[PDB]
């Protein structure tokens, strides 16, 4: 049906997280801030 999209998504790997902190835990390696 639909794609496995989540409210918090990585625009780099196309990762999907149901939790904001989980996405941040992932995208921090993209941000390096
Ligand atoms: Zn990513």
In total, the number of strands is 2
Bound molecules: zinc ion
Rough outline: elongated
Count of discrete structural domains: 1
H/E topology pattern: EEH
Largest sheet: 2 strands, antiparallel
Helix content: 25-40%
| Beta-strand content estimate | 5-15%
Compute the number of helices.
1
Radius of gyration: 10 Å
Distance between the termini: 37 Å
Helix-strand makeup class: alpha+beta
Subunit structure: Monomer.
Zinc finger (C2H2-type): 8-30
Function: Binds to the CACCC box of erythroid cell-expressed genes. May play a role in hematopoiesis.
Organism: Mus musculus (Mouse)
What does this structure look like?
There is one protein chain. This protein is α+β, with helices and mostly antiparallel strands and 33 residues long. It has one domain (1-33). Helices cover 36% and strands 12% of the residues. It has a two-stranded antiparallel sheet with strand order 1-2. The chain is elongated and about 35 Å long. The relative contact order is 0.23. Zinc ion (ZN) binds next to α1. Binds to the CACCC box of erythroid cell-expressed genes. May play a role in hematopoiesis. It comes from Mus musculus (Mouse). A zinc finger (C2H2-type) spans 8-30. Monomer. This is Krueppel-like factor 3.
